[PDB]
Amino acid sequence: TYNLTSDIDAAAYLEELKQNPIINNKIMNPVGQCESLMTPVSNFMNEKGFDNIRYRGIFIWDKPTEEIPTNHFAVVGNKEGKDYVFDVSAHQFENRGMSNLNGPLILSADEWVCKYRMAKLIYYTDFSNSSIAANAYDALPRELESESMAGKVFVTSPRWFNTFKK
């Protein structure tokens, strides 16, 4: 399967993003970049005629006792009644036990979820503001057992977490 949907001109959009030398370097070297890419990717999408732009804050938990979960960020937008996710730094995880995330993704929302599932406990929340997203899905210590799952959307629900929660 694929990283770039044909439902929209994702291949063209990726090339256009990569014509920007700063974005090109961040796609070549994505580790630590998802947060800084939110604003530029949103601007890009808006100018392409996507609307209802949201900022997707994500956690990836390996185990219940992890002190700081792994975070990630993507941008979601509507085009003609369907949501698409631009996640051009997904491949920051290629070398961290998610080898299937082997390039930038521009996918429908359902394809995006599918991609992460085929690649740990993963959940997200969409926000209207990128700094709100960043704050809610930050890199400070958090205890999974006492996190509110209110407003969390599960991508995965591993057996360990269902057992953990009881």
Residue numbers in the entry: 145 to 263, 267 to 313
How do the authors describe this structure?
SseI is secreted into host cells by Salmonella and contributes to the establishment of systemic infections. SseI (also called SrfH) is an SPI-2-translocated protein that has been directly linked to systemic infection. The C-terminal domain (∼140–322) of SseI contains its catalytic function and shows some sequence similarity (19% identity over a 88-amino-acid stretch) to Pasteurella multocida toxin (PMT or ToxA), which causes atrophic rhinitis in swine. Based on its structural matches, SseI is a member of a particular subgroup (clan CA) of the cysteine protease superfamily.
In this work, we were able to determine the domain organization of SseI and obtain a crystal structure of its catalytic C-­terminal domain (reductively methylated; residues 137–322) by SAD to 1.70 Å resolution. The overall structure and topology of the high-resolution (1.7 Å) SeMet-derivative structure revealed a single catalytic domain consisting of a core of six antiparallel β-sheets and eight surrounding helices. No density was observed for 12 residues at the N-terminus (137–144 and four vector-encoded residues), nine residues at the C-­terminus (314–322) or for residues 264–266 (a presumed disordered loop). The SeMet protein was purified using 10 mM DTT instead of 2 mM DTT to prevent Se oxidation, which may explain why it did not crystallize as a disulfide-linked dimer under these reducing conditions. It might also be the reason why seeding was not required to obtain large diffracting crystals of the SeMet protein. The higher resolution SeMet-derivative structure was used for all subsequent structural analyses. The SseI structure shows significant similarity to those of members of the cysteine protease superfamily, which allowed the identification of the catalytic triad: Cys178, His216 and Asp231. The measured Cys-to-His (3.5 Å) and His-to-Asp (2.8 and 3.4 Å) bond distances fit well to those expected for this type of catalytic triad. There is no room in this cavity for additional molecules and there are no other cavities from the surface that lead towards the active-site residues, making it likely that a small molecule such as water is involved in the catalytic mechanism of SseI. Looking at the region surrounding the active site, it is not obvious what type of substrate would be likely to bind, as there is both a positively charged and a negatively charged region on opposite sides of the solvent-accessible Cys178.
